[PDB]
């Protein structure tokens, strides 16, 4: 656990806190976006929204580190939400959501349903005006039965010339079909068979329902490619959460956050991308801290929209060993711990901060540095010094000698 957080502009003054972060690493090039507010992280005024791609390099201690060469900031930070970043062939495509009515997860009924994609180059040139920053136009969003579609999640994958941003689809609740007998209420008694259906949107009576998935953005569609939404399979289905599909050891792995009653970690190898079928890992040791009704290690079908985003990166497939940062606490979102876990036991862990250090969304990406598996974990750690949120990175080397 080595701090490399100094390699991003996370360090501001004590009056600004860094929210809504992003980290998307692929083939040695990363991405990073964040929203600088003024004062509180909740009600503060947005200062700017950096969206900066770069490259992953090495120091003299064989420690991987980030280095932004190219940075783009939208003219209006207030209308850019839920950015997703996918690398593709020396360009780094960042897909976000344009909203003049606030966060469209919250104010979904009045959302314009408009997206924006911003091309950034991981190797910018001297005078590459349209080569470095070229925000593409998305005039055709193939939704299907879904009324609105979002890129919802930090990172996605590329399949040759095709992109797959983690997504979510705002399906109207009335037309959402779900057989209540499939609600797993057998093991525990305080769960009605109708909690699975109602907990599938942010409110039990929400007009829309969030259904996570992918956004097929094929570059071979011409000058104006279509954003095709790919819904996720209904097995072990819960509310649409910030997902993360990443190409690990050859086959994509789909992490999907536990923002509902299924508080256990919900990620697994992807059998097929279109349609999206994810073989969720039957994990029994890794969960996330839910606030009120669905705390850590909860599996009863319950109506809640709670939890935090703690992705896990698959670092070994022959043994299904993966790594990530998870908040080792039941209800309070604190104590970020970098754990390396199998499906049924935590192998080893490293506590990144103190016991009572408030933490938040953690984004863990792993890679190979000269055939050594390192991991960069962007952890939103609450600094008690300046009493604000700062995303702290942690270059962690996965050891081979135990």
């Amino acid at each position, epitope marked *: 656990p080595k701090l490399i957080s100094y390699t991003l502009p996370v360090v501001g003054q004590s009056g600004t806190c860094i929210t809504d972060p992003l980290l998307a690493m692929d083939e040695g090039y990363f991405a990073y976006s964040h929203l600088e507010r003024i004062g509180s992280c909740s009600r503060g005024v947005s200062k700017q929204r950096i969206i900066g791609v770069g490259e992953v390099l090495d120091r003299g201690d064989e420690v991987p580190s980030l280095f932004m060469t190219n940075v783009w900031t939208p003219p209006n930070p207030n209308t850019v939400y839920h950015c997703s970043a996918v690398y593709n062939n020396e360009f780094y495509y960042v897909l976000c959501a344009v909203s003049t009515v606030g966060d*469209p997860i919250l104010n979904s009924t009045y959302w314009s349903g408009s997206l924006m994609m911003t091309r950034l180059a991981v190797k910018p040139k001297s005078n590459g005006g349209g080569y470095n920053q070229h925000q593409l136009a998305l005039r055709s969003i193939e939704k299907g039965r879904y009324d609105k579609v979002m890129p919802y999640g930090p990172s996605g994958i590329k399949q040759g010339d095709t992109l797959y941003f983690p997504a979510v689809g705002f399906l109207v609740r009335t037309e959402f079909k779900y057989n209540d007998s499939n609600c797993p209420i057998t093991k525990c008694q305080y769960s009605k068979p109708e909690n699975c259906r109602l907990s599938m949107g942010i409110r039990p009576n929400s007009h829309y329902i969030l259904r996570s998935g992918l956004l097929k953005y094929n570059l071979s569609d011409g000058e104006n490619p279509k954003v095709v939404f790919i819904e996720i399979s209904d097995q072990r289905l819960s509310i649409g959460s910030p997902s993360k599909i990443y190409d690990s050891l050859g086959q994509p792995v789909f992490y999907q956050a536990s923002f509902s009653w299924d508080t256990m970690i919900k990620f697994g190898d992807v059998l097929t991308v279109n349609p999206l079928v994810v073989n969720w890992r039957n994990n029994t040791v890794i969960s996330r801290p839910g606030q009120s009704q669905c705390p850590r290690f909860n599996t009863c079908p319950e109506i809640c929209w709670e939890g935090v985003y703690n992705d896990a990166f698959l670092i070994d497939r022959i043994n299904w060993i993966s790594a990530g940062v998870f908040l080792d606490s039941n209800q309070t979102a604190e104590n970020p711990v970098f754990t390396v876990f199998k499906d049924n036991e935590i192998l080893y862990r490293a506590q990144l901060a103190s016991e009572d250090t408030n933490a938040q969304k953690t984004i863990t990406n792993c890679f190979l540095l000269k055939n050594k598996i390192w991991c960069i974990s962007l952890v939103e750690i609450y600094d008690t010094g300046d009493n604000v949120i700062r995303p702290k990175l942690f270059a962690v080397k996965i050891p081979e000698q135990c």
Partner: antibody, heavy 129, light 108 residues
Framework: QVQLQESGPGVVKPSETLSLTCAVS?????????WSWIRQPPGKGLEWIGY????????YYNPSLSSRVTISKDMSKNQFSLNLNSVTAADTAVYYC?????????????????????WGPGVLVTVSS | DIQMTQSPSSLSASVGDRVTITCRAS??????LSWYQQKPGKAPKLLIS???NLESGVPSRFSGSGSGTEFTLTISSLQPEDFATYSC?????????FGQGTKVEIKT
């Protein structure tokens, strides 16, 4: 605007079921994601009891009162109740029913700021034989 | 649970004075704190949410600041209609624990 109104007997002997009722006027319990109960013993500070979703039947209760508190529901009369079992002299308080309010920012963060925007007028319930 | 301790328990100040009410949390809540004004015989009224927001209708003399463990309720220009019981409330986790209450008194 939603107006609440607690209702129940002001005299409850020790060691039986307290029975309150918070009638909801100006709004339906199908809205208002959570519905909480708060009491305040005389001479001490407010403490929280538990909430009911309204649209659902799921309850959470204060761990200091989890073994005793039962919160029921009624769509027909648009009211939700409270049932504190095995009341003692320490349960003398002013029981408020409140609309639990959640402030969601950045809906990739499902941890809202929870507070009570609408409170009932309250009712003094004294545990005496 | 998260113990919410206030200080002082009951203060006395004259009209127009600056009153600072502190509410200390056992665990670290980020900014999930709310301030309530409980007039005698009436239901508590929300003053400040997220520990720093002036709610609609609340006079500007009520200002809240602080985050983490120390939280502050500041009444800049105290008025005769501000002598009530002021309670902090944490929303970061459940059960929601109020403060023990602060009593404001006329210094005459």
């Amino acid at each position: 605007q939603v107006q609440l109104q607690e209702s129940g007997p002001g005299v409850v002997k020790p060691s039986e079921t307290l029975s309150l009722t918070c009638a909801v006027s100006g709004g339906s319990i199908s809205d208002t994601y959570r519905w909480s109960w708060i009491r305040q013993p005389p001479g001490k500070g407010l403490e929280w009891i538990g909430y009911i979703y309204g649209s659902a039947t799921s309850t959470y209760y204060n761990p200091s009162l989890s073994s005793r508190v039962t919160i029921s529901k009624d769509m027909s009369k648009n009211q939700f109740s409270l049932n504190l079992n095995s009341v003692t002299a320490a349960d003398t308080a002013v029981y408020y029913c409140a609309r639990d309010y959640q402030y969601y920012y950045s809906g990739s963060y499902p941890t809202p700021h929870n507070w009570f925007d609408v409170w009932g007028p309250g009712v003094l319930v004294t545990v005496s034989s | 649970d998260i113990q919410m301790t206030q200080s002082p328990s009951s203060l006395s100040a004259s009209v127009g004075d600056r009153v600072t009410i502190t509410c200390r949390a056992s665990q670290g809540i980020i900014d999930y704190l709310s301030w309530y004004q409980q007039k005698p015989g009436k239901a508590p009224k929300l003053l400040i949410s997220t520990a720093s927001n002036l709610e609609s209708g609340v006079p500007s003399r009520f200002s809240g600041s602080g985050s983490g463990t120390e939280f502050t309720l500041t009444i800049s220009s105290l008025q005769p209609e501000d002598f009530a019981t002021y309670s902090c409330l944490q929303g970061y986790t459940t059960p929601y624990t109020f403060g023990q209450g602060t009593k404001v008194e006329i210094k005459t």
